[PDB]
Design an enzyme around this catalytic site. Structure first.
Site, mmCIF file in Angstrom:
data_model
loop_
_atom_site.group_PDB
_atom_site.id
_atom_site.type_symbol
_atom_site.label_atom_id
_atom_site.label_comp_id
_atom_site.label_asym_id
_atom_site.label_seq_id
_atom_site.Cartn_x
_atom_site.Cartn_y
_atom_site.Cartn_z
ATOM 1 N N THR A 1 43.202 38.836 41.672
ATOM 2 C CA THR A 1 43.368 39.078 40.199
ATOM 3 C C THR A 1 43.106 40.557 39.617
ATOM 4 O O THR A 1 42.318 41.397 40.166
ATOM 5 C CB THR A 1 42.247 38.400 39.591
ATOM 6 N N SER A 2 44.301 40.987 39.054
ATOM 7 C CA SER A 2 43.998 42.101 37.987
ATOM 8 C C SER A 2 43.905 41.660 36.564
ATOM 9 O O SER A 2 45.337 41.061 36.098
ATOM 10 C CB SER A 2 45.532 43.168 38.063
ATOM 11 N N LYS B 1 46.406 33.314 33.430
ATOM 12 C CA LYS B 1 44.939 33.604 33.471
ATOM 13 C C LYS B 1 44.414 33.926 32.098
ATOM 14 O O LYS B 1 43.034 34.401 31.948
ATOM 15 C CB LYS B 1 44.691 34.961 34.518
ATOM 16 N N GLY C 1 38.803 42.259 37.938
ATOM 17 C CA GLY C 1 39.541 41.615 38.974
ATOM 18 C C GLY C 1 39.522 42.676 40.269
ATOM 19 O O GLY C 1 39.493 43.732 39.901
ATOM 20 N N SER C 2 40.080 42.010 41.600
ATOM 21 C CA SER C 2 40.205 42.754 42.838
ATOM 22 C C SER C 2 41.251 44.055 42.469
ATOM 23 O O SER C 2 40.778 45.181 42.936
ATOM 24 C CB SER C 2 40.536 41.909 43.829
#
Ligand SMILES: [Mg+2]
Ligand SMILES: [Mg+2]
Ligand SMILES: [Mg+2]
Ligand SMILES: [Mg+2]
Lengths: 233, 212, 222, 195, 222, 196, 125, 204, 195, 196
Positions: free
Chosen positions: J1-2, J33, J128-129
């Protein structure tokens, strides 16, 4: 059983002749990521106490709620809530110390180190420490984390025993604290430049200074440092 | 620890050392390892000091309650089984106890029960318990006869603890002696190994391994 | 251990506490942590006591042979290079943490060495368990352009911070001063601020207190 | 393996060694001699890790027999025991150490004295009036501390040994199938056939 | 994994005279190699002429002392202000400790006062409630340094009558409070020399039929 | 560590922070991570301080010997020597190194050597723990053939951001400029770069 | 659970439910016990308004509690089964813990205790 | 499985006025089981005394090794090795096994025959030299010995007084240790006579 | 614990159970009776985890004795063995299971047949002509497979048992101190006093 | 996720990529999301898909019940309900959630709730990552009181970069606009955002 996620680094503090000083930077780290930069870790309770908290921030916010709820509950059916029956630093501390030790005994700690700084109704200075294990102790200087390793030695040169406290002024004490905060910024990789400082004086009451900065830093000598041994240019 | 208890012609001998250890640290040389439950009941202690101490004085309370409710001193069988049933409840939790319940009653005669923390309960004539038990056995077994005089019996028990006190690093301090008869238990003194070893060496001519 | 090093005008000074430990026990109250590598190159050591001593001596020996071979006063960068390459070869297993300082035909120098073999350069350095107490003082009081007398004071203050605040450090302060154009001066027990107070009582025993079984004269002669 | 004992009396050393060889849940043998004659007045009993025991014993024996032939002279018990100790002391820091414990009983013809040495696999040597390896010691050392006198006859030593074996037969958890007993004195080495 | 225990160092010492008892302990509180406080008292007046110290993990020590003090309070409420004798206190403390047998208080406990004949008394406890009355006991980090000194100087162990051929023991006898305090002061200075966790200050609580008195002495602060 | 090297019109510039760390303790706040292996071939060091120093010392030695025998080595050659050391000893090294140099034929060149000891020739390179936070920024702001001043600004702004977010990074920003003109050392202190 | 205090005191100091329990006993078939020099005999009446009774199987009136103690009763037969079962269980439990069978007095005291408990517990008669 | 506490034992050395004392217990056990009451831990090479605690096999090995080295020293140097020099030899030899050490805590004691100075020193298993003016301790009861010595000791004790002090330090330390005791031996050492005394102690 | 055996012959079940109680390196007792009479014609021998064995045996005994008193009737061996099995089958999925193995020997008075049941701690029941628990089985099952006949007398069964014990005394590694032997037949339960 | 949420002049905008991943396999390349817990209180989800859905469903339920009894909840209130769930169940949750909503008194607000269940009110938030790679970019380019179009560009450029470097992130860029005007859904496909 827990692991701290968003953390606050050192909280440093000392007694002086009329009161206590306590300080702590405004950072909420996330591992090595310096994630949040407007985090207040000194939480005033009444006008005679400041509770400084390091460690897990989510647990710190929980403790904020507990303290703010504590003030409310003390006001209930208490006509002397802002006089003889106001919350003392010693009351606030014993409460937290009780909670911290209960939580460790249930194997589910509040992952924090706490310093309660304030002045009692009789004018006496209060400064005591409690952490996630429910361990407590008092000293003319107190610090958490790196502060214990780097601030205490500096603050102890000012107040090395009980008899030094009447000799120490608020200007001298604040200077030592502000200096200690600079050292921690030099040397602690999880500190920030911005910090808050609070004084609790038996005459002037509670002064709460926000948005301070480390200043008068020595960096110029860095230009002379080349290589790691033999390198000349 | 070393502790022992045996039956003979003239009743029961009970002897125990008095050392307590925390690893290789000698914590005490003056520990009471016999508990006098009543004038006809003794209990020995080996393993965890707290466990033995706590549960054997607890046992004393339960025995006292028995004679209040039943107007009769508790049998050795019933006393030992209260303790064995208690420790069996705690099985797996990590209690550490090797104990002997020694006593005389009219219905039983002189009786010794071995009870330990994994729930074993055994009636028997001779037992040695503790880290020095083997050393005690070696002496005790080779000199034991049913016919021993009260005097010889008392000495053998004393000598058997001394033997274990000598060889077992975790036994020592002093010997505490007891004799149990139809008339109840009789204490027979605290004997420091400090002086008892040299006195026995001289009078008996044993312990030749030792630079005299 | 606490150890420190501080540059000044015309040279460099190193200092150290004198406590040696085996766990919580103090094995030696007055051990020497300043090691001579050559007359004007001295090493302050922290870590495994045997390792700091052995590695300091080996390199000191090889430095002397080198100095004889080259017909030259030895340099600090040579001791630095030899020490780092030795420690690196052993991948950290030789637990020697060293502050190397000295003067040579090139000038005055101050370095530190980590057990894994990395080296630092600086005007002020500290190593060991008490290094944070020491570094707190150095970061507070150090300035560019120190006199010899200021650097000595700063160094021993830094060691005192360790002595009082670090349980791993204690007893006394040793100093060594290496000034350009002069002999190195080794100031053993420069400070002794931890002298034992008088005991309350003497425990000298009445003669014959101790029970004896045998005596014999031991032959130490041929 | 398991049980090996030794008693030194007035004019002899006596060695007693269990006869059982046990692997898993089977007693494979009940007549195993756990001993090697190193020289005519020196005997070594042994116990420990399977295979290692005999391999070590025989290796020592070969070395001592070699020495005898080379010098046409019998090494003293003290000299043999030191050789043995050094071999084990080397072994303990090898890639795979010899896990063998030994008792060495010898009669020193030059001193006219019997000598008993107890050496463990680490190379820990000690001279003793009586010795044992393994769990045997936990019963016999205290028994011997009591019933042992330094001036006993070979006959008295055997009775003392009978006491030890009887105690071990009573309190030991495992059936070790009795012992082979051997006497080392001025006349060399002989085996007591009915024990 | 969260480890619910820690180690706050310090060491304590109880001795019993004929008509008094002392309970001493240093005032240093530590974690790892840091000092938390140079004066944090750990020996407390519990009322009824009973002094108490619970040394090791301070959180557990404080919780125990708090519970025992509370136990004294309720003993008064329930038994018509009856004075809690030291033997009764000891047994009560056993149940306090053993009640947490499977999650122990990590403390060595010592209490001191007078028995019911007015004679000096010391009781010591293991972390799970095993207890014993003694003339003499050291507890905590430097227990192993101090304890054998006390065997020698308090109970005269290994000391014989001169010229008696190691046949007649030095005779047992009560010490004065003045002598007992000398032994305590010497015990702690010796322990301070050789144990890093012991230092800063020594606080002694002396107990006689007239109450509880205190004495305080500085110790080396390194 | 935050480190980078950027090619531009006249050559190449190497940049680095000055923080050496053992856990959260800053062992050195004035470290020099820009290391000379030859007159105009330098590298940026990240990872184990001991490893990357030992490697640079070896490389310097190799290129000194190379020079004596065959004259000035190419930047590609220098990068190959680093690779050989990093690749063949991958099991025992923690070294992320950026190699940067200036030829007169080839102008400015940048080679990055990550953990496995692979080599990657790039217009610019970023590495070290702090680099993660500026992949976005650097990709958006880098242009080819920037001037010296633009390049100095690109590095100053980039490392300022790396330092801002990475606790492992900090101190001064050191830079080394590599052109036909020679070798220039730049330093920028916190009070300048922190409030960009 | 059902909580009502059924056994309570009346103004004259009597517990009526206990006293009415005695009335149910008085209606019960007669039982007698006589003890000799060397034996004890338990005799019991069986009401004779019942023929076509099967006496092989109908619950006998003297119950063995253990092999050495017997119990007989007068009153509600269903109630007695509850006491007899409890008594039997206790007899085995006594042998198990004390390693001795119950004395007659002990067993009696137990049964008595059960009976008493039902006179001051809520929800029960 | 901790090599330094399988066998047990202690050694203590002490300096006095123109004399040194070195002392040891006699126990050799295998953990709980005491095995020998005759295992001395003090050796001498000429006028230099060496005590060694720790793993008994290494104790024996090192004695044999230092006898070996001091014998060759004497043959080549044509004089007996001095305490200061032997101390260095002990250190070199231990550090030579840096990554596979002898599990020992050696102690050196003696009087330099040229200068007359009393000399003591101790070592860790890996060769670090701990030099002291006053006392050195070693073994399984080293904490106890430290506490005994630190309070009992005073400087400049006369040989017969030093004997009492060192003996009382050893005896009381040994009695608080399960793995030490079973006899003791004390060496009093002066410029050119050495007295060896066997102490009477509790045998448990 | 360790050795418990059972043989069912023509008119009886025979149970043999080792007398040793061993803890660590000490035989604490050499006369332990590893059996409980459940009813006058039903006997249970047991072996397994210390404490658990007797606690289980006595608990079963109490239950069966309770049943007898309640019904004034003796439960059949088959009925008892099923009760026992179910208790163990419950136990195996408890927080702390009973680690006890049992043999149940009974004479069914209604069938006039002897019956032997082997049940392990998991609650695995099986009726057998002969049975054993532990390592004993590895020697005796093959021996009994050979020398056993279904119509043997009580005397012949005892001799067959003597064969088994002799083999166990020869090949078993541990001294189990002989056995107590008990016969369950139409007349109830009796112990053979010299074995 | 971003994922990210940004306050601006007229309200707040939530942005997210559309990648759900099990290891390196993309289980869903068109995930949503951006989740509604109330008319104008939405959240961005990152971490365990199961955890964050279960949390959002619970929060939606709580705010629906809140509304029935006390009217429209504040964004602060919504963030508190999330916190309570995330904090009290920290041992069993892997949920990094950004809460964003629009009052008429308070305008646009953004609260971020990281792993421990702490709450942080901010002008904008990234998580997020993929967020690691744009700390640099976002800190440099965010201004307060941007217009709707500027804010949409800020999110589009930022997430474009997060997606570029984070393999875990990808697919479409979804956005949700929260103003007094109502609720607007935006989507941007790879061919538009990839070559920004
Ligand atoms: Mg002993
Ligand atoms: Mg210190
Ligand atoms: Mg989960
Ligand atoms: Mg992608």
């Amino acid at each position: 059983t827990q692991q701290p996620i968003v953390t606050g680094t050192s909280v440093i503090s000392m007694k002086y002749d009329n009161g206590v000083i306590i300080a702590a930077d405004n950072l909420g780290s996330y591992g090595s990521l310096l994630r949040f930069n407007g985090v207040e870790r000194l939480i005033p309770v009444g006008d005679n106490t400041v509770v400084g908290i390091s460690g897990d921030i989510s647990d710190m916010q929980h403790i904020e709620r507990l303290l703010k709820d504590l003030v409310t509950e003390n006001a209930y059916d208490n006509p002397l809530a802002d006089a003889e029956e106001a919350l003392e630093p010693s009351y606030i501390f014993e409460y937290l110390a009780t909670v911290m030790y209960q939580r460790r005994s249930k194997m589910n700690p509040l992952w924090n180190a706490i310093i309660v700084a304030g002045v009692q109704s009789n004018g006496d200075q209060f400064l005591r420490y409690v952490n996630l294990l429910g361990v407590t102790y008092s000293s003319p200087t107190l610090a958490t984390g790196f502060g214990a390793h780097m601030a205490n030695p500096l603050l102890r040169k000012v107040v090395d025993r009980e008899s030094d406290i009447p000799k120490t002024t608020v200007q001298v004490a604040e200077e030592a604290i502000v200096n200690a905060m600079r050292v921690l910024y030099y040397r602690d990789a999880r500190s920030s430049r911005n910090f808050s400082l609070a004084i609790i004086d038996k005459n002037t009451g509670l002064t709460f200074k926000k948005n301070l900065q480390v200043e008068n830093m020595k960096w110029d000598f860095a230009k002379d440092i080349k290589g790691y041994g033999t390198q000349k240019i | 620890t070393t502790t022992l208890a045996f039956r003979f012609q003239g009743g029961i001998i009970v002897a125990v050392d008095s050392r307590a250890t925390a690893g290789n640290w000698v914590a005490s040389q003056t520990v009471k390892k016999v508990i006098e439950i009543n004038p006809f009941l003794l209990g020995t202690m080996a393993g965890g000091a707290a466990d033995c101490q706590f549960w054997e004085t607890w046992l004393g309370s339960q025995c006292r309650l028995h004679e209040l409710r039943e107007k009769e001193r508790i049998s050795v069988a019933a006393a030992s089984k209260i303790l064995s049933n208690l420790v069996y409840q705690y099985k797996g939790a990590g209690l550490s106890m090797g104990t002997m319940i020694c006593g005389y009653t009219r219905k039983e005669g002189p009786t010794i029960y071995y009870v330990d923390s994994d729930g074993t309960r055994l009636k028997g004539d001779i037992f040695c318990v503790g880290s020095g038990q083997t050393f005690a056995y070696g002496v005790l077994d080779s000199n034991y006869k049913w016919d021993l005089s009260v005097e010889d019996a008392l000495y053998l028990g004393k000598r058997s603890i001394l033997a274990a006190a000598h060889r077992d690093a975790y036994s020592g301090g002093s010997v505490n002696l007891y004799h149990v008869t139809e008339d109840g238990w009789i204490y027979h003194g605290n004997h420091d190994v400090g002086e008892l070893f040299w006195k026995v060496k001289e009078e008996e001519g044993s312990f030749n391994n030792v630079i005299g | 251990t606490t150890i420190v090093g501080v540059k000044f005008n015309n040279g460099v000074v190193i200092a150290a506490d004198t406590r040696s430990t085996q766990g919580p026990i103090v094995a030696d109250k007055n051990c020497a942590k300043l090691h001579r590598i050559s007359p004007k190159i001295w090493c302050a050591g922290a870590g495994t006591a045997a390792d700091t001593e052995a590695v300091t001596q080996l390199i000191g020996s090889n430095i002397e042979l080198h100095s004889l071979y080259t017909s030259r006063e030895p340099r600090v960068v040579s001791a630095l290079q030899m020490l780092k390459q030795h420690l690196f070869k052993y991948q950290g297993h030789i637990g020697a943490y060293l502050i190397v300082a000295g003067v040579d035909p090139t000038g005055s120098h101050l370095f530190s060495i980590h057990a894994n073999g990395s080296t630092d350069v600086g005007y002020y350095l500290s190593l060991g368990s008490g290094s944070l107490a020491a570094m707190a003082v150095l970061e507070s009081h150090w300035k560019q352009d120190l006199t010899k007398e200021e650097a000595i004071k700063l160094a021993s203050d830094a060691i005192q911070a360790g002595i009082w605040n670090d349980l791993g450090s204690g007893s006394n302060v040793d100093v060594c001063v290496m000034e350009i154009g002069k002999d190195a001066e080794y100031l053993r027990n420069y400070l002794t601020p931890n002298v034992r107070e008088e005991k309350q009582k003497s425990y000298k025993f009445p003669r014959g207190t101790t029970a004896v079984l045998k005596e014999s004269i031991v032959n130490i002669c041929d | 393996m398991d049980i090996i004992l030794g008693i030194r009396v007035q004019d002899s050393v006596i060695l007693a060694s269990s006869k059982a060889v046990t692997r898993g849940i089977s007693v494979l043998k009940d007549s195993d001699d756990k001993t090697r004659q190193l020289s005519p007045h020196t005997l070594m009993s042994f116990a420990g890790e399977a295979g290692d025991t005999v391999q070590f014993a025989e290796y020592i024996q070969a070395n001592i027999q070699l020495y005898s032939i080379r010098e046409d002279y019998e090494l003293s018990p003290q000299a043999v025991s030191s050789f043995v100790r050094q071999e084990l002391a080397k072994s303990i820091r090898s890639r795979r150490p010899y896990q063998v414990n030994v008792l060495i009983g010898g009669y020193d013809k030059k001193k006219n004295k019997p000598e008993l040495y107890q050496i463990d696999y680490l190379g820990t040597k000690v001279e003793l009036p009586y010795g044992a390896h393994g769990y045997s010691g936990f019963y016999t050392f205290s028994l011997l501390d009591h019933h042992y006198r330094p001036d006993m006859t070979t006959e008295e030593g055997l009775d003392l040994l009978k006491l030890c074996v009887q105690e071990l037969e009573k309190r030991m958890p495992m059936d070790f199938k009795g012992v082979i007993v051997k006497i080392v004195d001025k006349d060399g080495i002989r085996q007591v056939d009915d024990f | 994994q969260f480890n619910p225990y820690g180690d706050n160092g310090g060491t304590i010492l109880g001795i019993a005279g004929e008509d008094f008892a002392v309970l001493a302990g240093d005032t240093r509180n530590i974690t790892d190699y840091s000092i938390n406080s140079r004066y944090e008292p750990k020996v407390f007046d519990c009322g009824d002429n009973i002094v108490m110290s619970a040394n090791g993990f301070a959180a557990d020590g404080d919780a125990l002392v708090k519970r025992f003090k509370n136990s004294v309070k309720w003993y008064h409420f329930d038994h018509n202000d009856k004075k809690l004798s030291i033997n009764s206190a000891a047994r009560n403390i056993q149940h306090l400790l053993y009640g947490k047998r499977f999650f122990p208080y990590y403390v060595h406990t010592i209490i001191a006062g007078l028995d019911e004949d007015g004679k000096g008394a010391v009781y010591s406890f293991d972390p799970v409630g095993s207890y014993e009355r003694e003339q003499c006991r050291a507890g905590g980090a430097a227990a192993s340094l101090i304890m054998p000194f006390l065997d020698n100087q308090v109970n005269f162990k290994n000391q014989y009558e001169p010229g008696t051929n190691g046949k007649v023991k030095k005779p047992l006898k009560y010490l004065s409070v003045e002598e007992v305090i000398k032994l305590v002061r010497d015990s702690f200075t010796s322990a301070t020399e050789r144990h890093i966790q012991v230092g800063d200050g020594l606080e002694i609580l002396i107990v006689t039929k007239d109450g509880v008195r205190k004495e305080f002495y500085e110790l080396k602060r390194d | 560590t935050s480190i980078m090297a950027v090619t531009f019109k006249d050559g190449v510039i190497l940049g680095a922070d000055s923080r050496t760390t053992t856990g959260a303790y800053i062992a050195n706040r004035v470290t020099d991570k820009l290391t000379r292996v030859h007159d105009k071939i330098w590298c940026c060091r990240s990872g184990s301080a001991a490893d990357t120093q030992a490697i640079a010392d070896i490389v310097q030695y190799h290129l000194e010997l190379y020079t004596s025998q065959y004259g000035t080595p190419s930047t590609e050659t220098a990068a190959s020597v680093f690779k050989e050391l990093c690749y063949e000893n991958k099991d025992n090294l923690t070294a992320g190194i950026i190699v940067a140099g200036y030829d007169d034929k080839n102008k400015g060149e940048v080679y990055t050597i990550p953990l496995g000891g692979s080599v990657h020739k790039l217009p610019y390179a970023i590495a070290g723990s702090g680099s993660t936070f500026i992949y976005g920024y650097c990709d958006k702001n880098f242009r080819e053939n920037m001037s010296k001043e633009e390049t100095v600004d690109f590095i100053k702004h980039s490392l300022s951001q790396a330092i801002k977010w990475d606790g492992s990074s900090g101190g001064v920003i050191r830079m080394v400029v590599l052109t036909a003109a020679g070798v220039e050392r730049l330093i920028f202190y916190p009070d300048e770069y922190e409030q960009l | 659970g059902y909580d009502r205090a059924l056994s309570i005191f009346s103004p004259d100091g009597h517990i009526f439910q206990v006293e009415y329990a005695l009335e149910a006993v008085k209606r019960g078939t007669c039982a007698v016990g006589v003890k000799g020099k060397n034996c004890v005999v338990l005799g019991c009446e069986r009401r004779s308004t019942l023929k076509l009774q099967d006496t092989r199987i109908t619950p006998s009136k003297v119950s063995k509690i253990d092999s050495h103690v017997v119990l007989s009763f007068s009153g509600l037969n269903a109630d007695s089964r509850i006491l007899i079962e409890k008594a039997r269980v206790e007899a085995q439990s006594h042998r198990l813990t004390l390693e001795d069978p119950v004395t007659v007095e002990y067993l009696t005291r137990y049964v008595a205790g059960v009976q008493q408990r039902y006179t001051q517990s809520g929800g029960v008669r | 499985s901790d090599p330094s506490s399988i066998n047990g034992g202690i050694v203590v050395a002490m300096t006095g006025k123109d004399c040194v004392a070195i002392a040891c217990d006699l126990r050799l056990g295998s953990q709980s089981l005491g095995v020998s009451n005759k295992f001395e831990k003090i050796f001498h090479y000429g006028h230099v005394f060496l005590g060694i605690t720790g793993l008994a096999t290494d104790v024996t090995t090192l004695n044999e090794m230092f006898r070996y080295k001091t014998n060759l020293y004497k043959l080549k140097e044509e004089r007996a090795i001095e305490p200061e020099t032997f101390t260095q030899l002990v250190s070199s030899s231990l550090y030579e096994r840096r990554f596979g050490p002898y599990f020992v805590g050696p102690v050196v004691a003696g009087i330099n025959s040229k200068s007359g100075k009393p000399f003591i020193a101790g070592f860790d298993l890996i060769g670090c030299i701990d030099e002291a003016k006053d006392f050195i301790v070693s073994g399984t009861a080293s904490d106890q010995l430290f506490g005994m010595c630190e309070s009992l000791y005073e400087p400049n004790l006369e040989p017969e007084d030093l004997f009492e002090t060192i003996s009382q330090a050893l005896l009381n330390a040994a009695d608080r240790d399960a793995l030490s005791g079973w006899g003791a031996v004390v060496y009093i050492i002066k410029k050119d006579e050495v007295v060896k005394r066997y102490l009477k102690m509790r045998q448990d």
